[PDB]
Paper text:
Animal-like cryptochromes are photoreceptors that control circadian rhythm and signaling in many eukaryotes. As evolutionary transitional forms, some CRYs like the aCRY from Chlamydomonas reinhardtii (CraCRY) are bifunctional by acting both as photoreceptor and photolyase. CraCRY uses a tetrad of four aromatic residues (14–16) for FAD photoreduction and subsequent formation of the signaling-relevant FADH• state. Like in other PCSf members of the aCRY/(6–4) photolyase branch, these residues (CraCRY: W399, W376, W322, and Y373) form a 22-Å-long ET pathway from the surface of the C-terminal photolyase homology region (PHR) domain toward the FAD chromophore.
Without external reductant, FADox➔FADH• photoreduction of CraCRY stalls in the semiquinoid FADH• state. In CraCRY’s FADH• state, helix α22 (H475-K494) and two regions nearby, N314-D324 in the α13/α14 loop as well as A404-Q410 in the α18/α19 loop, are disordered because of lacking electron density. Consequently, the ET pathway along W399-W376-W322-Y373 to the FAD chromophore is broken. First, the Y373 side chain, which packs closely against W322 in FADox and FADH− states, is released from any interactions by becoming completely solvent exposed. Secondly, W322 is indispensable like Y373 for photoreduction but belongs now to the disordered α13/α14 loop. Moreover, the FADox➔FADH• transition causes loss of the prominent salt bridges between α22 and the PHR domain, namely D321-R485/R492, D323-R485 and D371-H475. The order-disorder transition upon FADH• state formation is unusual as a surface area of 870 Å2 from 14 α22 residues is occluded from solvent access by interacting with the PHR domain. CraCRY’s FADH• state structure provides numerous additional interaction sites for downstream signaling partners like the circadian clock factor ROC15 (33). Our in crystallo observation of a partly unfolded FADH• state prompts us to note that refolding to an FADox-like conformation, concomitant with restoration of the ET pathway from Y373 to the chromophore, is required for further FADH•➔FADH− photoreduction. In contrast, continuous illumination used to obtain the static FADH• state structure drives the reaction completely toward the signaling state.
Residue numbers in the entry: 3 to 45, 50 to 313, 325 to 403, 411 to 474
The structure:
Amino acid sequence: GVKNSIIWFRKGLRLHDNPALLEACKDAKHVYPVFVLDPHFLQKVSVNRYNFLLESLEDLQRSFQARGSRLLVLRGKPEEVFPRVFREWGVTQLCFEHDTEPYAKVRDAAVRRLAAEAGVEVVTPISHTLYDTDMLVARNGGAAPLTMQSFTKLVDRVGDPPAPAPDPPAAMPPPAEDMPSAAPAATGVPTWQEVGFKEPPLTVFKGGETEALARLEAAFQDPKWVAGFQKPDTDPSAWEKPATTVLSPYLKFGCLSARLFHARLLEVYRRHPAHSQPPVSLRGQLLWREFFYTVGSTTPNFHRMAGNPEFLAAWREARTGFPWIDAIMTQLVTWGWMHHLARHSVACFLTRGDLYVSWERGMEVFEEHLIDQDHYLNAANWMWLSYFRVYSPVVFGKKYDPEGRFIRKFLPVLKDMPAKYIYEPWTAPLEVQRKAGCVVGRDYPAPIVD
Ligand SMILES: Cc1cc2c(cc1C)N(C[C@H](O)[C@H](O)[C@H](O)COP(=O)(O)OP(=O)(O)OC[C@H]1O[C@@H](n3cnc4c(N)ncnc43)[C@H](O)[C@@H]1O)c1[nH]c(=O)[nH]c(=O)c1N2
């Protein structure tokens, strides 16, 4: 006789542009905001990324409490928890954002069956991508386009992505009182210590929808920078103020709506007729993401499109002996984010013909440490790898940073090396090494390859 609904967060960790949340609140006597956390994640995942998620859930908790509700972090597996709470809470509707990843399809199909057995309606809107990816494939005749230029042609044919959804109401229907499965002590957001991590996170990027919107506003503080953006011309050695938006972790977890980002770019583009165009523009960057999601989700053998241990270990542990390479690998572990062309440098130095190895092994290392780790974006970018015309990937940074400021920041052992040798410290006169307190082979390794 009443509507009791669940809004289930997996991605889409936001209140803004959340059509699943708007549906669950409509005409609802009680709404249960749920995140399902697998407590036994022990089995691979850096504390930096997991803490980013926890911070994002803490932000959601604060947002829901401001509106008379709270987030319920349920422990267990969705297939076991949901049948119990469907009956306990008298649920009539279950809402959640659509997800096209492989595991998500298996998980969501099972939950859809359990909902039907309990008489629960399921509503799953598209809001993680700009477009309904299935719709794009259908309008392309039933096959995903295979080049960026062709893909940009198709979306231009389709038109603008949908507008961001309205903000939710200032007050929300709360969960019912004294429901055993909603008890606060069993449903709070845990800390990185409580989930089992021993080392603290070191990244400088904080999770959550609130920080995402703050960072988006900062990127749009200069419309001329947004209008003139060209990805290949940005500086990979810029760390104090990165040369790109660093919105990737926020888009990965859904703290930031891709649709809101796109709408804001078109606002700026209307007033700047000479703005950059795809693929180098900031809109092009969003379209790279959409392109790889579309191809990845509709391609069965997606990982097969691109056709010894010691070299990988040195690369993994930032001891290759090339300061530019080791500095980036240090940024990976410490920040979990590096500029696109820094990612290119270490990836080419690993796969494009310096250490050979297999690109899959390099992806595994990225998958552990990147805070923007994305099943589709990580793999696709490794394969699309297969710029250094003058500067080889091992001294690439010298073009932008002849003094080696980036290297000195992340490899402080080299902080007193004269700039003439900071990219090739093995060339320094051996008394220069002594003076700088950095002897090659003692304080910093010699190059691992001739
Ligand atoms: C080896 C390797 C591995 C990865 C990636 C590249 C390479 C070469 N990338 C892509 C890229 O390096 C990354 O998206 C940016 O460095 C993120 O920086 P900004 O958010 O400042 O991007 P910037 O502000 O330039 O772009 C804005 C947004 O567009 C998207 N975007 C930009 N460049 C992209 C690209 N090349 N491919 C797809 N989407 C792109 C992202 O959503 C990004 O947040 C990736 N990206 C990611 O989100 N998760 C990942 O796990 C990886 N892994």
